[PDB]
Write an enzyme that holds these catalytic residues in place. Structure first.
Site, PDB file in Angstrom:
ATOM      1  N   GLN C  34      32.146   7.849  38.262  1.00 28.33           N
ATOM      2  CA  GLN C  34      32.020   6.622  37.429  1.00 28.33           C
ATOM      3  C   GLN C  34      31.292   6.931  36.110  1.00 28.33           C
ATOM      4  OE1 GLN C  34      29.638   3.988  40.098  1.00 28.33           O
ATOM      5  NE2 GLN C  34      28.709   5.965  40.669  1.00 28.33           N
ATOM      6  N   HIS C  65      17.314  -7.413  44.739  1.00 27.63           N
ATOM      7  CA  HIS C  65      16.926  -6.484  45.814  1.00 27.63           C
ATOM      8  C   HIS C  65      16.153  -7.215  46.914  1.00 27.63           C
ATOM      9  CE1 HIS C  65      17.941  -3.573  42.595  1.00 27.63           C
ATOM     10  NE2 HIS C  65      18.684  -3.130  43.617  1.00 27.63           N
ATOM     11  N   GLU C  89      19.676   3.308  42.526  1.00 28.09           N
ATOM     12  CA  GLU C  89      18.449   3.224  41.714  1.00 28.09           C
ATOM     13  C   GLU C  89      17.191   3.229  42.552  1.00 28.09           C
ATOM     14  OE1 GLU C  89      20.457   0.550  42.614  1.00 28.09           O
ATOM     15  OE2 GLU C  89      20.810  -0.556  40.742  1.00 28.09           O
ATOM     16  N   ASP C 109      24.077   7.667  48.888  1.00 33.68           N
ATOM     17  CA  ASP C 109      24.832   7.327  47.664  1.00 33.68           C
ATOM     18  C   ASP C 109      25.819   8.472  47.365  1.00 33.68           C
ATOM     19  OD1 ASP C 109      25.572   6.805  44.799  1.00 33.68           O
ATOM     20  OD2 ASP C 109      24.216   5.108  45.119  1.00 33.68           O
ATOM     21  N   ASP C 141      29.668  10.380  50.380  1.00 31.67           N
ATOM     22  CA  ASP C 141      30.452   9.136  50.575  1.00 31.67           C
ATOM     23  C   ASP C 141      29.917   8.445  51.844  1.00 31.67           C
ATOM     24  OD1 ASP C 141      32.453   7.167  51.014  1.00 31.67           O
ATOM     25  OD2 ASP C 141      34.088   8.434  50.432  1.00 31.67           O
ATOM     26  N   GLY C 142      29.551   7.192  51.749  1.00 27.52           N
ATOM     27  CA  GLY C 142      29.073   6.455  52.909  1.00 27.52           C
ATOM     28  C   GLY C 142      30.104   6.389  54.020  1.00 27.52           C
ATOM     29  N   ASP C 162      24.686  -1.806  49.697  1.00 29.37           N
ATOM     30  CA  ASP C 162      24.306  -2.084  48.311  1.00 29.37           C
ATOM     31  C   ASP C 162      25.245  -1.259  47.420  1.00 29.37           C
ATOM     32  OD1 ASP C 162      23.093  -2.948  46.007  1.00 29.37           O
ATOM     33  OD2 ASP C 162      21.379  -1.579  46.203  1.00 29.37           O
TER      34      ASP C 162
HETATM   35  C1  MTA Z   1      23.762   1.174  41.774  1.00 27.67           C
HETATM   36  S1  MTA Z   1      23.867   0.519  43.425  1.00 27.67           S
HETATM   37  C2  MTA Z   1      25.611   0.792  43.840  1.00 27.67           C
HETATM   38  C3  MTA Z   1      25.869   2.234  44.255  1.00 27.67           C
HETATM   39  O1  MTA Z   1      27.036   2.272  45.147  1.00 27.67           O
HETATM   40  C4  MTA Z   1      27.389   3.650  45.112  1.00 27.67           C
HETATM   41  N1  MTA Z   1      28.645   3.829  45.806  1.00 27.67           N
HETATM   42  C5  MTA Z   1      29.844   3.388  45.431  1.00 27.67           C
HETATM   43  N2  MTA Z   1      30.790   3.730  46.335  1.00 27.67           N
HETATM   44  C6  MTA Z   1      30.092   4.439  47.306  1.00 27.67           C
HETATM   45  C7  MTA Z   1      30.501   5.141  48.529  1.00 27.67           C
HETATM   46  N3  MTA Z   1      31.820   5.153  48.895  1.00 27.67           N
HETATM   47  N4  MTA Z   1      29.528   5.668  49.260  1.00 27.67           N
HETATM   48  C8  MTA Z   1      28.236   5.672  48.885  1.00 27.67           C
HETATM   49  N5  MTA Z   1      27.765   5.106  47.707  1.00 27.67           N
HETATM   50  C9  MTA Z   1      28.720   4.494  46.977  1.00 27.67           C
HETATM   51  C10 MTA Z   1      27.406   3.992  43.621  1.00 27.67           C
HETATM   52  O2  MTA Z   1      27.396   5.375  43.345  1.00 27.67           O
HETATM   53  C11 MTA Z   1      26.168   3.208  43.127  1.00 27.67           C
HETATM   54  O3  MTA Z   1      25.050   4.015  42.824  1.00 27.67           O
END
Ligand code: MTA
Ligand code: MTA
Ligand code: MTA
Ligand code: MTA
Lengths: 287, 288, 287, 288
Positions: C34, C65, C89, C109, C141-142, C162
């Protein structure tokens, strides 16, 4: 593609503005006189902004500075002494110094912060002009400089007014009056030339016409011409006042020989461009 | 004053610059099969035609556009009798061409009936009755097909004026800007014929501009490039004139003015001195 | 006064955007995932921007938050193990760590550049949370983290999502599906709670409703609430899914005692705010 | 999509934030002696009233505004029979107050005949016939003068609703936001009377908000502060309710719902649970 996410809102007429993508902000300074920003734009490269108006861009300033300076310098058969009022980024001085006839060039800007930030951040504009041994940079209101020049009996061959706009700028307003052009005439040699930018005749006809009538009240030869400056959103109007030499009488050959003899190298201005500038009517609202 | 408004047109230009223009009124909005049409009133420029967000013409500055598009080509031709216009939906290109007293037959071909009909109704200062001149015919057709039909039929014109939507934005006009299309235009010109087209803007869209220029140059021995600032568009429109026989650079201001007088052409902008300036001013390009 | 001269054009719905005065640009980075900007705004102070959308501002992030984190944390009678997806953040982590019951908090993140730029430029957001001995920061990746957690038989008490918005973000899209919430349920203890932001029900009802139905397909207790975040231009929607504990059954007294017992200090969230969030219907277009 | 358009309202908000809102149509533009009026259609919010560039009400979200302004005060009063509205030119405040079956006499006072007349013509979903209810009277007058006359006449009301242009922007409403004006409002309330006003926004305009709040507090023993997000405005509008006798915090959801039912009040938003949330949610302020 649309402009952003970070954008400059550049005023134009009050009823039209430009929305310009910004890539970076290099400097922000509120001087005693005006709000200064030096920034990078996507379409125009680096810019100087004063009170929200782009004054010059890397991509198109040479259209402005060559059109302001060379018609008047080429019209004068021997310009030795040059005065510039305004021109804080140094590019007006840069162009005037190209003329090998020039022995003395003085640039007078009210705002030390514009000149110092230009020195630091706009090297493609000044290109060392501030350091030429023929150049002097003076920080003063041009109105006061011209009054001191009259007391001294100072005289110039070419005077170039490169000020903030007549339609927006309080700090420059006294320099656009009939009375100011009468003072200019007093610090010209009898064959002298003045040139000023005069805003825009399409969007700001009243302010344009006021500058034009103040030149005409003081100079018997007057030429009006304009050049589109993309970063500004309009064709800047120039007014050239002359005591002796008629710019309308130069041929593309006479201009190109004066340029070659004097060692002047340009990106835009030529004798054919001079001919076109002398023949294209200026824009007005037609309805 | 810094931000025009409260109601504003966001007019695209380059993708990295746009214009914000105060709007006073919205007279018509139509989604045609081809494009989105708006007729509106602007404070700076008076009434406008907008197609896909781009001002096409304004009351205050359209004569700069239409006179610059039409008259250099028409004045360069010694006796233009048969004129073809591709595009020109508001009727002002046809208005200018009809001023030449030599013209016997003028055909205008626009793809979009709705542009012509809304211009008839809402832009009388642009058409000024041109659609109803007995020398004029208005055809609603893709200009691509019209020219294919003209070639089959052996039809020929003296002057062909292309007043289309922009080469850098307009899918509906794309096929009319190619080298192949300018070879078809040559086939429907008389041996001393002239073509002129608008070609977008060389400063902001040099690649698109250059492809139109190389398409004209491949097909015409004389090519003149000139530009004119159109305030309401935000740029100097580039024009490209291709000629088979007569060179617009050879016409002096006195010759231009005499031809305009003899033909009964009244203008707000174009004169012999304007022609000389157009013939001598280089077009804008990004310098860094 | 109007916004500028330098402005952020912050998208909102496609048919509404915000025009926000910018004072400075601190950082611009195109990451693999991004476009990141860290900038100063006049109305909201310092901001994180991702793909043109403000994610957090100094002036109003605590509304976001605290509203994301404390209703779920206060609803759980003993949250020891916390997972955060997104939250780059650090402020989500900051709030969760205030709960003295928490022994382990993991934040996941996808984008190292968001976390590293936040570390460097957003200290009022993270406030050292990344360095708490109870915290672990994971760059992944979550979606993949949750699949590995299932293989490991990992379980949490509270999971906080989040992420970037469900209506705009390709990188987060797989984490907003019914199938993802079924995976979340598999890495919760039988009395677990999930909370996610869900975009906005007024401007993006279809995307909202998709997230809501995916929570409801997996959790028998669901609470919907929203809080106006000025810098975003709308009231962010939250969805809380619970396996056992009903957030609607807490009294302002039970919340304020859990907060006091656990040492939680807030700028916004209280037991009366909890009551209001549990009773205010979410916004929809009414015509 | 990033930049709504092509035709857009630039709606002010704070001076450092504005909204860009796509416009589909402009139905009316009138410069009245008091303000600039626009009735337009927006894509996100449907038809709007705009006064001096600020959306006053939209079809899609005005019920959030009007129900939140009117019903907490009306439901808190045990028997509101006589209602005064200052401002409310589109008629939706009057529409909501008339829903209460206790109301016998409602007077609405707007300074600007042109707002009322253009609302009658172009905003039927806002007034819904309220202007023509036999219990209603519409007076065109400065509310400042109306209240001075009411005091001379000894007139009294149960509930006074102030639905004026904003305290932070509006010269025409400025004198109605002062401590002195709230002392005049007390003089035209019955001993158990209630006042409610919109008070701009505490997040973006805390100074202006606080001066209205201190003006109410000086004159009323019970003061409730609550806010509701209005999408089309870009913020949560702050409301301030002053009461002489009855405390809106003492009304449970069941009591609110029973009063709405007994009085025949149908709403799209306001309920007893909404009242409870309004009574408990603190108002927004900049936190850093
Ligand atoms: C700023 S808070 C939102 C956050 O979501 C994160 N984000 C977006 N998609 C994913 C994902 N698939 N897994 C983990 N974090 C993610 C982004 O990198 C961002 O920092
Ligand atoms: C950037 S070129 C225009 C310049 O005009 C200068 N200027 C404006 N008013 C005056 C004045 N009265 N005297 C001298 N320079 C001026 C500004 O400081 C600016 O740098
Ligand atoms: C308003 S002047 C430009 C005109 O070009 C017309 N136009 C665009 N593409 C074509 C095409 N393929 N054939 C003819 N007219 C066209 C448009 O409908 C418009 O009215
Ligand atoms: C549209 S709701 C707000 C209304 O407040 C009205 N208003 C503003 N100032 C005053 C005033 N002094 N007296 C009565 N109405 C007013 C405006 O004319 C507008 O219709």
């Amino acid at each position: 593609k649309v402009p952003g996410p970070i954008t400059l809102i550049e005023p134009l007429s009050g009823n039209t503005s430009l929305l310009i993508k910004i890539n970076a902000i290099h400097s922000v300074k509120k001087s005693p006189y005006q709000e200064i920003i030096i920034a990078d734009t996507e379409d125009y490269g680096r810019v100087l902004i004063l009170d929200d108006y782009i004054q010059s861009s890397y991509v198109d300033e040479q259209y402005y500075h060559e059109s302001l300076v060379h018609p008047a310098m080429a019209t004068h058969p021997n310009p030795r002494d040059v005065l510039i009022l305004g021109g804080g980024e140094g590019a007006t001085l840069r162009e005037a110094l190209k003329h090998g006839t020039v022995k003395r060039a003085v640039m007078v800007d009210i705002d030390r912060d514009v000149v110092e930030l230009s020195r630091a951040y706009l090297p493609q504009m000044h290109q060392g002009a501030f350091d030429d041994p023929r150049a002097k940079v003076v920080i003063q209101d041009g109105f006061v400089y011209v009054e001191e020049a009259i007391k001294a009996g100072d005289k110039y061959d070419v005077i170039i007014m490169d000020l903030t706009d007549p339609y927006s700028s309080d700090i420059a307003k006294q320099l656009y009056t009939r009375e100011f052009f009468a003072k200019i005439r007093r610090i010209l040699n009898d064959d002298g030339v003045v040139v000023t930018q005069a805003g825009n005749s399409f969007y700001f006809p009243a302010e344009y016409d006021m500058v034009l009538e103040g030149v005409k009240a003081n100079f018997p030869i007057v030429a009006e011409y304009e050049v589109w400056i993309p970063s500004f959103g309009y064709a800047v109007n120039f007014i050239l006042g002359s005591l002796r030499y008629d710019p309308h009488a130069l041929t593309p050959s006479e201009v190109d020989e004066r340029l070659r003899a004097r060692g002047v190298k340009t990106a835009f201005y030529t004798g054919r461009v001079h001919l076109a500038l002398m023949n294209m009517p200026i824009h007005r609202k037609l309805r």
